[PDB]
Design a protein around this ligand. Structure first.
Ligand SMILES: [K+]
Ligand SMILES: [K+]
Ligand SMILES: [K+]
Ligand SMILES: [K+]
Ligand SMILES: [K+]
Ligand SMILES: [K+]
Ligand SMILES: [K+]
Ligand SMILES: [K+]
Ligand SMILES: [K+]
Ligand SMILES: [K+]
Ligand SMILES: [K+]
Ligand SMILES: [K+]
Ligand SMILES: [K+]
Ligand SMILES: [K+]
Ligand SMILES: [K+]
Ligand SMILES: [K+]
Ligand SMILES: [K+]
Ligand SMILES: [K+]
Ligand SMILES: [K+]
Ligand SMILES: [K+]
Ligand SMILES: [K+]
Ligand SMILES: [K+]
Ligand SMILES: [K+]
Ligand SMILES: [K+]
Ligand SMILES: [K+]
Ligand SMILES: [Mg+2]
Ligand SMILES: [Mg+2]
Ligand SMILES: [Mg+2]
Ligand SMILES: [Mg+2]
Ligand SMILES: [Mg+2]
Ligand SMILES: [Mg+2]
Ligand SMILES: [Mg+2]
Ligand SMILES: [Mg+2]
Ligand SMILES: [Mg+2]
Ligand SMILES: [Mg+2]
Ligand SMILES: [Mg+2]
Ligand SMILES: [Mg+2]
Ligand SMILES: [Mg+2]
Ligand SMILES: [Mg+2]
Ligand SMILES: [Mg+2]
Ligand SMILES: [Mg+2]
Ligand SMILES: [Mg+2]
Ligand SMILES: [Mg+2]
Ligand SMILES: [Mg+2]
Ligand SMILES: [Mg+2]
Ligand SMILES: [Mg+2]
Ligand SMILES: [Mg+2]
Ligand SMILES: [Mg+2]
Ligand SMILES: [Mg+2]
Ligand SMILES: [Mg+2]
Ligand SMILES: [Mg+2]
Ligand SMILES: [Mg+2]
Ligand SMILES: [Mg+2]
Ligand SMILES: [Mg+2]
Ligand SMILES: [Mg+2]
Ligand SMILES: [Mg+2]
Ligand SMILES: [Mg+2]
Ligand SMILES: [Mg+2]
Ligand SMILES: [Mg+2]
Ligand SMILES: [Mg+2]
Ligand SMILES: [Mg+2]
Ligand SMILES: [Mg+2]
Ligand SMILES: [Mg+2]
Ligand SMILES: [Mg+2]
Ligand SMILES: [Mg+2]
Ligand SMILES: [Mg+2]
Ligand SMILES: [Mg+2]
Ligand SMILES: [Mg+2]
Ligand SMILES: [Mg+2]
Lengths: 129, 123
RNA sequence: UGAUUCAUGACUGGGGUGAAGUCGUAACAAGGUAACCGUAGGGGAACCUGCGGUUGGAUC
RNA sequence: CAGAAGAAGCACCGGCUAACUCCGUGCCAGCAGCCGCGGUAAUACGGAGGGUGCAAGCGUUAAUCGGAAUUACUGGGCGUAAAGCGCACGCAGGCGGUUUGUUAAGUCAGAUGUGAAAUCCCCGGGCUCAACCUGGGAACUGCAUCUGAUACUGGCAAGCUUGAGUCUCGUAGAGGGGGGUAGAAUUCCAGGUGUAGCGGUGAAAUGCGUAGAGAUCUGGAGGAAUACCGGUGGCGAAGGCGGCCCCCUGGACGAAGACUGACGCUCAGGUGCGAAAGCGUGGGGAGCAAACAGGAUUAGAUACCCUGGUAGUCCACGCCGUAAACGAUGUCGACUUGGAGGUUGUGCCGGCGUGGCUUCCGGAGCUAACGCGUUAAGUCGACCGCCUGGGGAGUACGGCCGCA
RNA sequence: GCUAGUAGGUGGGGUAACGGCUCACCUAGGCGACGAUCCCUAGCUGGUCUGAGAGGAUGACCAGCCACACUGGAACUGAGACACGGUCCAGACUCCUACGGGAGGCAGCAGUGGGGAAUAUUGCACAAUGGGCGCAAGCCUGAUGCAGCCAUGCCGCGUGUAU
C-alpha cells in the first residue's frame, strides 16, 4: 500500500522530467505544498497551484533549460523505514553546496542553507541537485 | 538486507583459520626429527625434495622442508621450524631454519647467506 | 546414579587426494534411446525402467 | 693533545617491483608470496662482475588492521553467475491516506552539571637538534537536569473520503464438493459364418492358431477415460481443473448509486493447502505397466526393440510434504513513449468510447551480456525470505516430524 | 524453559546501614525469544594498533577500578581486613626430630631450577619526591631515585672533506 507520499511526490517529479512532461499532478497535502514552495524559490520547478476543495490536487510546472531537465537528481533521505535527523552543525551539503537539502525544522520546511542561518537542525527530507 | 533484518541478525564476519596451526601463533617452534627422507613433488615439477617429520615441543607431528643444497639432519636431530608452505609438496606447511640448533648452514653459500645460516667469509 | 566433554578401540561406512592398472562408455552434437527434476523398483559400475513434471531439447 | 687516524652491513635485480650480464648446472641440483622457473644459449637454480633498495641495521617467521564495496550502517547482491520459502492465511513485530486541535515522548535550540590525569590534536615553552619533557587550549562526538521551539514522527480528541470494506442488479468461467447418466473404443465371455494363417520387426524369434485362431456378425459382462468442440482459449492462491444432467458451494468482473469511515500493507514463529511416486486398511482391476520371464540385438546387453506381465495407475478414509512445485523472477502500492492481437463486461451513434484479465513485438531506461521493457529485469516506497569461492555436503552427528 | 528463600507480604531477629540479610507464618508468585537457564571463552576502563571515515582488532608499559596471595575453609583484632611477608583448622609438597612432636609458602626486589622461539644484576643510595613512627633530631623504606645487562623500539650523530 501507499506508505510514503513524499517519496511518491519526488518520484513523480523524477519520472515526469525524464518523460519531458510539462507538468505533473498529484493528490495534495500541506507537507507536499511546503516542499513545493522550497522547490520554487530555489528555481527547481517553475510554479505550482492547488486546485480543488474536498480532494485537493497539487500541480507542479516543471522546467527545462536547454532542452534538459533542471532537476538533475532528486532523492528521498529520511523515509518511514529509517528517519534521519541532523543537528545544526551536521546539516548535509548537496553537491558541494550547488544543490539543496530540504530540511524540516521547528520553524518550518526550508533549505539547508536557511536552516544553517537560523541555527537549527531538523529532519532531512530530500536532496535536490 | 533491510535495516530491520540487520537489527535482528547483524552482519557476520568470517573467521579465518591459520595456515600454520602447529606454530600456535609462535614465530618458531622446536622439534625432534622422527624421520628424514625425500619425496617427489606435484605435477608439473620433478625432483627429490628433502623433508623431515618433526615432533614439536607442543606435541604436534608435522612435516618440514629442508631448504638449501645438502644438509646434516638425521633422526633425533633437534631443529627449529618456521612458517612457510612449500607449494609443490603435498601438505608441507613449515620450513626448517638453517643454522639454528642442530641444523647446519649450507656449505659454500655466498649470496642470501642469512637465509641459510652462513657466516660471512673472511675475505 | 545421571549429564557433558576429551582420548582411545577389533571391525566397519562413505569422503578427499595421488597415481594410473582393470571393466565398460553415462554426459557434452539429436552424444548415436533428447537431457534433467522428484519418486519408486532393478542392476558389477557408470546407470536402466515406470509415473508425473521442466526446456536449461536438435530436427521439423 | 694526537692522528683519517678506531668505525658497513643486509636483502634484492623474469613480471607485480626500483635494479642485467657472463659462467656453472641440464625436469638434476635447486628456487617459490603468486604467476611460475629448471628438458644444453636459465636476466627466475648456484658463483661472479655490475646494479637497485634500506643502512647500524637488514632480512625471515608469527600476529592485527588495510587493500577487501570479499558481511556492503556509511557501502553489495538474488531471471541465467551463490541467492525469492511450492502456495497461502495470520499472531507478535515493522510500516501507515487526509484535516483541525491538543500533548511535547522522538527531534531541534540554549543553559548548567558531569565526561579524572596522561594519551591524540592546535599554539607555544625547555633539553645544542630530534626523540623526550612541559604550559595553555581544543577535544572527550556521551549521560542527566532545566528552559524553550513545534515543521516532521509518536500519543490523545474530533473529523474527512480518495485506500480498504458492505449492499443492490447482472455477466463469463474445465473453480470446488456430492450424486446420476450417455455414446465411442479396448479386453473378456457365449454363439453364427468361415479356413490357414495371425501377430510382430530394420530383419526375426518368442507368442497365438486345424483342440478352428486372425477376420466378420449378434448378444452379454466389466473397468477406465471423455474424440470432435479446443483456441500462445477460460477458471483457480499455488498444486491444478475438460462429455452431459441435477444438488450444495467459493472467487472474479462490470454498470449506476447508497453505506461504513483508515477498519490498511507486510509478516519471524504458528497454522492450512500442496503434482507424481510411495505407505496403511478395505474395495476395484478393462487398458497401461516399474519388478519379473522369455525372444532378439551385441564383444557383452542385467538396456534401447519384441512377446508376455505383478505392484501401481481407479475408489473410500488416513499418512507422506517432496518436484526444472519454473516466469528458475516474494507480496502490496505509486509513477513513466508506442504497435498489433485474444478474451470478457459496459456506454453512446457497423461507428465512437470506457473497464477487467491475457499473447506477441518494441521505445526510453536498465543489464556482464542475453535480454526486460506500463503484466519491468525502468523510476520509487513498505515489509518479508535468501546469498557470501569450488569440492567435502544439503552430507555426518544431535533435535523435531514420519508406520516406513 | 528456569526458580521453593524461589517472588512478594506480615511479624521477630540481625547489620554501621536498606534489604530474604535471616527465621516463623501467609499469599503463589518471580525470570524468559528485548534470549532466561545451561555451555565455551574472558579481568574492565582511560587508551593502543589499523583505517579517508564508519568501522575492525586489541587491553603490554603508564593511570583509575576490581579480584587474588601454596590449595580449601573460618573467624579474631581493628576506624578500616575476613588481612601477600598475621591467627586457627584441613590438604598436597619440602624440611627438622631424641619418633612424642615441630617448621615453611618470592604472583615484594634480586636470584636459582624448570618450561619455552623468547625477556636482565643475588648493584648503589635514602641526596631528591613520597610513605610509617616521633615534639624534634632521627630511624625505617628492593616505594622511589639511580647504576648494570640486552640494537627491543624511537630519535640524533659518526664511520671523513676538497682535489
Ligand atoms: K617443471
Ligand atoms: K567413543
Ligand atoms: K542416457
Ligand atoms: K541433450
Ligand atoms: K527416473
Ligand atoms: K555382476
Ligand atoms: K653448457
Ligand atoms: K547496504
Ligand atoms: K459457480
Ligand atoms: K513462515
Ligand atoms: K504390455
Ligand atoms: K557392440
Ligand atoms: K496388473
Ligand atoms: K512423500
Ligand atoms: K514453466
Ligand atoms: K478489452
Ligand atoms: K468494448
Ligand atoms: K516473505
Ligand atoms: K509401511
Ligand atoms: K534469600
Ligand atoms: K520481610
Ligand atoms: K575499545
Ligand atoms: K583463593
Ligand atoms: K599490601
Ligand atoms: K628518602
Ligand atoms: Mg553415451
Ligand atoms: Mg543419450
Ligand atoms: Mg532430494
Ligand atoms: Mg530393468
Ligand atoms: Mg522400455
Ligand atoms: Mg623493473
Ligand atoms: Mg646456461
Ligand atoms: Mg640466481
Ligand atoms: Mg571492510
Ligand atoms: Mg556481489
Ligand atoms: Mg546452473
Ligand atoms: Mg543459480
Ligand atoms: Mg514463486
Ligand atoms: Mg498475506
Ligand atoms: Mg501519517
Ligand atoms: Mg521533547
Ligand atoms: Mg582527560
Ligand atoms: Mg626549541
Ligand atoms: Mg598539553
Ligand atoms: Mg505533533
Ligand atoms: Mg500528530
Ligand atoms: Mg498417487
Ligand atoms: Mg513397497
Ligand atoms: Mg494403496
Ligand atoms: Mg488397495
Ligand atoms: Mg514392455
Ligand atoms: Mg525444494
Ligand atoms: Mg507446474
Ligand atoms: Mg509453466
Ligand atoms: Mg526456486
Ligand atoms: Mg520486449
Ligand atoms: Mg538483473
Ligand atoms: Mg539429510
Ligand atoms: Mg510429518
Ligand atoms: Mg538487596
Ligand atoms: Mg525482615
Ligand atoms: Mg583467565
Ligand atoms: Mg576502508
Ligand atoms: Mg571488631
Ligand atoms: Mg598483611
Ligand atoms: Mg611472600
Ligand atoms: Mg622475582
Ligand atoms: Mg629451555
Ligand atoms: Mg630492614
Amino acid at each position: 500500500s501507499m506508505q510514503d507520499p513524499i517519496a511518491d511526490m519526488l518520484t513523480r517529479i523524477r519520472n515526469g522530467q525524464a518523460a519531458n512532461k510539462a507538468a505533473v499532478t498529484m493528490p495534495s497535502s500541506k507537507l507536499k505544498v511546503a516542499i513545493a514552495n522550497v522547490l520554487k524559490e530555489e528555481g527547481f520547478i517553475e510554479d505550482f497551484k492547488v486546485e480543488g476543495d474536498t480532494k485537493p490536487e497539487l500541480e507542479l510546472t516543471l522546467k527545462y533549460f536547454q532542452g534538459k531537465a533542471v532537476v538533475e537528481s532528486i532523492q528521498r533521505v529520511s523515509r518511514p523505514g529509517l528517519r534521519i535527523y541532523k543537528r545544526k552543525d551536521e546539516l548535509p551539503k548537496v553537491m558541494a553546496g550547488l544543490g539543496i537539502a530540504v530540511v524540516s525544522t521547528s520553524k518550518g520546511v526550508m533549505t539547508d542553507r536557511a536552516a544553517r542561518q537560523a541555527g537549527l537542525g531538523g529532519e532531512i527530507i530530500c536532496y535536490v541537485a | 538486507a533491510t535495516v530491520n533484518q540487520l537489527v535482528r541478525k547483524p552482519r557476520a564476519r568470517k573467521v579465518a583459520k591459520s595456515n600454520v596451526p602447529a606454530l600456535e601463533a609462535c614465530p618458531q617452534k622446536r622439534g625432534v626429527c622422527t624421520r628424514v627422507y625425500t619425496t617427489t613433488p606435484k605435477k608439473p615439477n620433478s625432483a627429490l625434495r628433502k623433508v623431515c617429520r618433526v615432533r614439536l615441543t607442543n606435541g604436534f607431528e608435522v612435516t618440514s622442508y629442508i631448504g638449501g643444497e645438502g644438509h646434516n639432519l638425521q633422526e633425533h636431530s633437534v631443529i627449529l621450524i618456521r612458517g612457510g608452505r612449500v607449494k609443490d609438496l603435498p601438505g608441507v606447511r613449515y620450513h626448517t631454519v638453517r643454522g639454528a640448533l642442530d641444523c647446519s648452514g649450507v656449505k659454500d653459500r655466498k649470496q642470501a647467506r642469512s637465509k641459510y645460516g652462513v657466516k660471512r667469509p673472511k675475505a
